[PDB]
Design a protein around this ligand. Structure first.
Ligand SMILES: CCCCCCCCCCCCCCCCCC(=O)OC[C@H](COP(=O)([O-])OCC(O)COP(=O)([O-])OC[C@@H](COC(=O)CCCCCCCCCCCCCCCCC)OC(=O)CCCCCCCCCCCCCCCCC)OC(=O)CCCCCCCCCCCCCCCCC
Ligand SMILES: CCCCCCCCCCCCCCCCCC(=O)OC[C@H](COP(=O)([O-])OCC(O)COP(=O)([O-])OC[C@@H](COC(=O)CCCCCCCCCCCCCCCCC)OC(=O)CCCCCCCCCCCCCCCCC)OC(=O)CCCCCCCCCCCCCCCCC
Ligand SMILES: CCCCCCCCCCCCCCCCC[C@@H](O)O[C@H](CO[C@H](O)CCCCCCCCCCCCCCC)COP(=O)(O)OCC[N+](C)(C)C
Ligand SMILES: CCCCCCCCCCCCCCCCCC(=O)OC[C@H](COP(=O)(O)OCCN)OC(=O)CCCCCCCCCCCCCCCCC
Ligand SMILES: CCCCCCCCCCCCCCCCCC(=O)OC[C@H](COP(=O)(O)OCCN)OC(=O)CCCCCCCCCCCCCCCCC
Lengths: 106, 62, 52, 446, 32, 422
């Protein structure tokens, strides 16, 4: 595979990640996704610990935005430590919807 | 008691509401024409010889 | 949109086509009647008399 | 190895044979070591008047209480020493006495059966005992809610007709009957050619015909004074009956429209439509947004507890509708969905639903016939209904003719813009008035 | 005991075509 | 038509028993029988089986829940899960041409179940609905108490989940039970419309699943306790059971004849069972509505023979005394020959009439295959049932009288006796 292009792709993605300010508030990537019915069901399937963590980090972000403050540098989220915890659940829900729609047309 | 006539009207033009609406529209179009013509004729009869329409002939092109 | 395709959605349109034609006809006649549109009305056997 | 329509051709056929008096004898032979022999009679509450409304039910209670040859407990002692099972049932249009036993005892069974339909002793003391028994059983039926609402539906849909009254009859009527009305009812009705003998299982038609002649050949076929009980058509009435009792747990509505007689082709197509709507219950597995449309919506707001679609057929007329239970607060919503489904069938019917309905119908026909007793019942009911026994191959052929367009036309013929009959027994304060119910039988968009 | 219930006569309100308890109503429904 | 076919048996090296028959009916039927039951649970996990049989429609690794229901529904077939303390039976029905489709689901549901935890949690409240419907009939509550009153460990386990466990069943317990009890050697497969050779290769797929033997249970010990309930109902129920023989034994046949001598089952409708000894003994004891008959439950480990009596609260004591006194007279040696023949005829007619239906026939074949794996034709049943002698029945009656008794009684109980005074 392409090495220089892949490294350039990784570099620009990391640059874009730092440009987005949600890491400044301790938010993970999966917290910012718009909450449509599919996301609502996906959240309903989360285990209690991840659900509890998600709610608290959202509260902290809202609280910080309240006073126009920013979390300290050392506590910013890092590009390599992020875990896409919500990806498997959302994918399964979307696939189920596609199967239902495919059946419904015939 | 034209029960057959009412039966035919229902089976063809009232069972579906789309046809029901269409008959209503044509009926009102015809009804207004007939109603207007008949009513005006009655009015003219009751007031014969007084309306300008009845005396204009004595001055128009005259 | 892609979900709207399929053998049955075509069938549903076919069933409702007669109703769509009738409703469209109802609207067209209603518009002509309401507006007293002489252009179309002049070709009506009896209604044309209204026009003088 | 065998296709569906190919397996249909391996089903044995029924052999019919008349006796001199006009009795019809039918039989379907097999290799099973058991058989079911019964007599079906075209007598029901439809042939009764106010003075003898409960006669048919009352006689059923005295059918096996003793006879001239076997008085008292002699009849049941013989039946039980044989290991057989003696059963009976009644209806508004039919009556039946049938015995399940071993083929090795075919002779005796017929003898007893003949004895029960010709020599029914009517001792008076027994009549008094049955009076109280029927009085108590009527009280039990009151507890059952479904029976109550189905009798109400008949009472309102056949107002002023012999089909309106129930099989059991009024309580006041059962306490004044005598041994003279019962004998008149028995003599006037139970006789050939109305009777139909049937025997399915490991029985040979030849043996079934000699035995019948020996015992059943003596039944008269001539009416006294030529007082023939002629049948008459029945009128259908679009009306509602509301019996309100808020102490009861759930509302118990029942609706139905007029439907064909048993002997019209259209009924087959109607059955397919009833398969599309389907039935629902609270114990069924899955189905939440996963089953038929009425049941999928049945669990989105938890509307119904259980709904079923019925199609009751009588001669020249019948009832077609849907019975459902529901909570006090969700009566109107359930009715709204049901009426929408009917109208959708009348206007927008896809072939995919039809194919599912046809498959369900095939399964019900084949699976229902499993067992000897259901087979014997079908023979008797068909011989008194059509005059023949439609074979499975014919049923499949007629079903295959069904198409989405066919269903649309037939449903429009019987469902669209027709006045319904409604019966409700429970907390029914939310039940919509007749005018609203009647306005929901058509579509302003169509 | 519920079998003792029966609808009272409506003959004074019924329409002419449905006044007989033997003639079928299907032959006049479309007309009415 | 062709000649009457016979059923073919075979035992794969795994230990699975495969049986097939080739009739010519247009509807095909397939069944999976598993030695798993409510008796294999311990105190740590309880109500697992009651929830497990409700999961038949849940998603699998090879098929989605949506697919299973829609596919079965469109074909017009059915799938049911019969359950009992000893066994669990999956069954499916469809047409001849659709077998290959439905088997794919059936195999999947029992080979690769994927107990999604959120699906399990959403299914939990259904347990209450099912339990309530069953208890609507008081007979269910009396027996489940009766088993809990006569057995200490194994068969005392209820068929329904206890109330406190309704919200606390987990998917891990479901998984653990499946691995340890869905072993191939414990299973049997039965087919009616399908051909035997194709059955071999469809079943070849799961030969890479399960295997060996599973987790054995414990021999059910007998206690002899009582469990009264004291509910507000006017009609009191009861039960009077004692240790019996083991399922599939010569002594077990004598007990079967014994109960039918005592008018176990009604035959004629709307008619008094004059031939029944118990109804005669009770008729001259009470003049108000009553119901009585004998009870017989044979299991692999042990059996239980007894009596059940519905009666008025005031007359409960008299009814029970009359029934118990009647059994003593039989045990004393007062037994006529005619009753033996009449009871035997009832048995044979019941057996053949019950197996007559295809569904029951498939159930009887599966039950026999699991324990033995060798079908025993009805004629052999008749020879076994005709070998019973009078002395055998007298010995059976004497054993019941001398044995310790367990009693479960729901009702008002104002006048119902206790054990040690009956
Ligand atoms: C709807 C829009 C209607 C506007 C046109 C209607 C009048 C027709 C017309 O002007 O000639 C054009 C043409 C010829 O018709 P005509 O009957 O020979 O002329 C009669 C004159 O109105 C005769 O005009 P007049 O000067 O001899 O007499 C006065 C006349 C003239 O007054 C008006 O036309 C008023 C127009 C107001 C319309 C807008 C109202 C809503 C906003 O007012 C009336 O007598 C009443 C008729 C006007 C329509 C009232 C009913 C509207 C509902 O008419 C049309 O094409 C009808 C248009 C409707 C179809 C839409 C086509 C769009 C593509
Ligand atoms: C030009 C011809 C255009 C034809 C367009 C047909 C569109 C059909 C449609 O989609 O909705 C059915 C339509 C209700 O339309 P929608 O509320 O927008 O519901 C949209 C979905 O279809 C959802 O439908 P849905 O779930 O609401 O159920 C269907 C229907 C079920 O019927 C009902 O339950 C309503 C019962 C009371 C009706 C009378 C309301 C008081 C007047 O619902 C209604 O009729 C609601 C009527 C509410 C009217 C607004 C309140 C009164 C002002 O009801 C009909 O049965 C057809 C009426 C067509 C009138 C044409 C008059 C031409 C002059
Ligand atoms: C703008 C100012 C207006 C002022 C109006 C003042 C009115 C004062 C007087 C009030 C009179 C009240 C009664 C008027 C209607 C009486 C009849 C009505 O109540 O019945 C309903 C009326 O319902 C409608 O008829 C339903 C069909 C809709 C017909 C719409 C016709 C529209 C015509 C005009 C269209 C104009 C288009 C213009 C385009 C530019 C239901 O009839 P129903 O018998 O139970 O329907 C059965 C349907 N079947 C036949 C198919 C079985
Ligand atoms: C003047 C206003 C009152 C009279 C006209 C409106 C009316 O009659 O309401 C009822 C009419 C028909 O609707 P309805 O049959 O009652 O029920 C919905 C269809 N299933 O609903 C209508 O509104 C019909 C007229 C609009 C189309
Ligand atoms: C101007 C409007 C006048 C409206 C009233 C018309 C007269 C009274 C109508 C009536 O009472 O309704 C009953 C209805 C119509 O009367 P019908 O039975 O058809 O024939 C009567 C022949 N004397 O009886 C019917 O059969 C019609 C069914 C609808």
């Amino acid at each position: 595979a392409v090495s220089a292009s892949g490294k350039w792709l990784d570099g620009i993605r990391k640059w874009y990640y730092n440009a987005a300010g949600f890491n400044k508030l301790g938010l993970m990537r999966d917290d910012t996704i718009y909450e449509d019915e599919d996301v609502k069901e996906a959240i309903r399937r989360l285990p209690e610990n991840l659900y509890n963590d998600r709610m608290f980090r959202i509260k902290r972000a809202l609280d910080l935005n309240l006073k126009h403050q920013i979390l300290p540098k050392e506590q910013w989220t890092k590009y390599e430590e992020e875990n896409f915890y919500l990806e498997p659940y959302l994918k399964e829900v979307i696939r189920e919807r596609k199967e239902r729609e495919e059946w419904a047309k015939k | 008691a034209a029960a057959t006539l009412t039966s035919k009207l229902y089976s063809l033009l009232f069972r579906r509401t789309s046809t029901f609406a269409l008959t209503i529209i044509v009926g009102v179009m015809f009804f207004e024409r007939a109603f207007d013509q008949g009513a005006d004729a009655i009015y003219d009869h009751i007031n014969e010889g007084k309306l300008w329409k009845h005396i204009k002939h004595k001055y128009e092109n005259k | 949109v892609t979900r709207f395709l399929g053998p049955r959605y075509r069938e549903l349109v076919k069933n409702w086509v007669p109703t769509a034609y009738t409703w469209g006809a109802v609207g067209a006649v209603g518009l002509v009647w309401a507006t007293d549109w002489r252009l179309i009305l002049d070709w009506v056997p009896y209604i044309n008399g209204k026009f003088k | 190895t065998a296709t569906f329509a190919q397996a249909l051709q391996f089903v044995p056929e029924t052999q019919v044979s008349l006796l001199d008096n006009g009795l019809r004898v039918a039989s379907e032979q097999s290799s099973q070591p058991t058989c079911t022999v019964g007599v079906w009679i075209d007598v029901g509450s439809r042939f009764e008047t106010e003075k003898n409304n409960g006669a048919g039910y009352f006689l059923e209670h005295l059918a096996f209480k003793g006879t001239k040859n076997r008085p008292g407990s002699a009849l049941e002692k013989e039946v039980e020493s044989m290991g057989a099972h003696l059963n009976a049932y009644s209806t508004r249009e039919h009556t039946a006495y049938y015995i399940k036993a071993l083929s090795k005892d075919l002779p005796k069974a017929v003898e007893l059966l003949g004895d029960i339909v010709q020599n029914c002793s009517l001792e008076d003391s027994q009549i008094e005992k049955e009076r109280d028994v029927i009085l108590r059983e009527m009280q039990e039926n009151d507890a059952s809610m479904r029976d109550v609402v189905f009798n109400y539906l008949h009472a309102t849909a056949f107002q002023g007709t012999p089909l309106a009254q129930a099989v059991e009859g009024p309580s006041e009527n059962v306490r004044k009957l005598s041994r003279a009305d019962l004998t008149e009812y028995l003599s006037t009705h139970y006789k050939a050619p109305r009777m139909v003998l049937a025997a399915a299982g490991g029985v040979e038609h030849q043996q079934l015909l000699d035995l019948a002649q020996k015992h059943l050949g003596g039944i008269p076929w001539t009416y006294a004074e030529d007082a023939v009980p002629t049948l008459t058509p029945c009128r259908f009435t679009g009306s509602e009956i509301r019996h309100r009792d808020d102490a009861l747990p759930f509302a118990h509505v029942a609706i139905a429209v007029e439907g064909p007689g048993w002997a019209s082709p259209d009924n087959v197509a109607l059955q397919v439509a009833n398969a599309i709507i389907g039935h629902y219950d609270c114990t069924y597995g899955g189905g939440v947004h996963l089953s038929s449309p009425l049941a999928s919506g049945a669990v989105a707001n938890k509307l119904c507890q259980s709904f079923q679609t019925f199609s009751i057929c009588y001669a020249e007329t019948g009832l077609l509708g849907a019975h459902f239970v529901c909570d006090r607060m969700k009566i109107d919503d359930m009715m709204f969905v049901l009426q929408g489904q009917w109208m959708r069938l009348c206007t927008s019917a896809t072939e995919s639903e039809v194919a599912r309905g046809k498959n369900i119908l095939r399964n019900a026909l084949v699976s229902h016939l499993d067992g000897t007793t259901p087979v014997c019942e079908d023979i008797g009911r068909s011989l008194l209904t059509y005059g023949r026994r439609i074979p499975l191959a014919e049923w499949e052929s007629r079903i295959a003719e069904v198409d989405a367009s066919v269903v649309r036309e037939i449903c429009s013929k019987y469902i669209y813009d027709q006045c319904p009959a409604v019966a409700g027994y429970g907390p029914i304060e939310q039940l919509p008035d007749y005018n609203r119910i009647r306005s929901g039988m058509f579509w302003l968009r169509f | 005991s519920h079998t003792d219930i029966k609808v009272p006569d409506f003959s004074e309100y019924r329409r002419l075509e449905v006044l007989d308890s033997t003639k079928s109503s299907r032959e006049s429904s479309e007309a009415r | 038509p062709p000649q009457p076919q016979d059923l073919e048996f075979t035992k794969l090296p795994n230990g699975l028993v495969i049986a097939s028959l080739e009739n010519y009916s247009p509807v095909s039927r397939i069944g999976l029988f598993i030695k798993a039951g409510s008796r294999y649970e311990d105190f740590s996990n309880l109500g697992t089986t009651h929830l497990l049989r409700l999961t038949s429609s849940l998603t699998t690794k090879g098929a989605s829940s949506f697919k299973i229901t829609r596919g079965i529904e469109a074909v017009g077939g059915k799938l049911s899960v019969t359950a009992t303390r000893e066994n669990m039976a999956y069954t499916v029905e469809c047409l001849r041409g659709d077998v290959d489709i439905l088997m794919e689901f059936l195999l999947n549901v029992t080979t690769a179940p994927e107990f999604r935890r959120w699906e399990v949690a959403d299914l939990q409240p259904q347990l209450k609905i099912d339990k309530a419907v069953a208890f609507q009939n008081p007979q269910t509550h009396v027996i489940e108490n009766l088993h809990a009153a006569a057995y200490r460990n194994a068969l005392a386990n209820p068929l329904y989940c206890p109330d406190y466990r309704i919200g606390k069943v987990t998917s891990e317990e479901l998984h653990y039970f499946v691995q340890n009890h869905f072993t191939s050697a414990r299973m049997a497969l039965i087919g009616l419309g399908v051909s035997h050779p194709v059955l071999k290769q469809v079943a070849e797929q799961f030969l890479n699943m399960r295997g060996g033997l599973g987790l054995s249970g414990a021999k059910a010990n007998y206690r002899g306790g009582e469990i009264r309930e004291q509910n507000g109902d006017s009609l009191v129920h009861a039960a009077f059971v004692a240790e019996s023989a083991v399922a599939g034994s010569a002594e077990a046949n004598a007990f079967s004849v014994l109960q039918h001598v005592l008018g176990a089952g009604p035959h004629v409708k709307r008619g008094s069972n004059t031939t029944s000894h118990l109804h005669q003994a009770v008729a001259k004891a009470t003049q108000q509505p009553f119901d009585v008959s004998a009870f017989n439950a044979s299991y692999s480990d042990s059996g239980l023979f007894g009596i059940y009596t519905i009666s008025q609260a005031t007359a409960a004591g008299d009814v029970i005394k009359a029934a118990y006194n009647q059994v003593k007279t039989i045990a004393q040696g007062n037994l006529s020959n005619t009753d033996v023949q009449a009871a035997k005829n009832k048995l044979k007619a019941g057996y053949l009439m019950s197996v007559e239906s295809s569904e029951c026939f498939l159930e009887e074949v599966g039950s026999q295959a699991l324990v033995a794996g060798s079908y025993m034709p009805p004629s052999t049943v008749l020879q076994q049932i005709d070998s019973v002698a009078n002395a055998d029945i007298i010995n059976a009656a004497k054993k019941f009288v001398s044995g310790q008794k367990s009693m479960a009684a729901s009702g008002n109980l104002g006048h119902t006796p206790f054990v040690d005074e009956l």
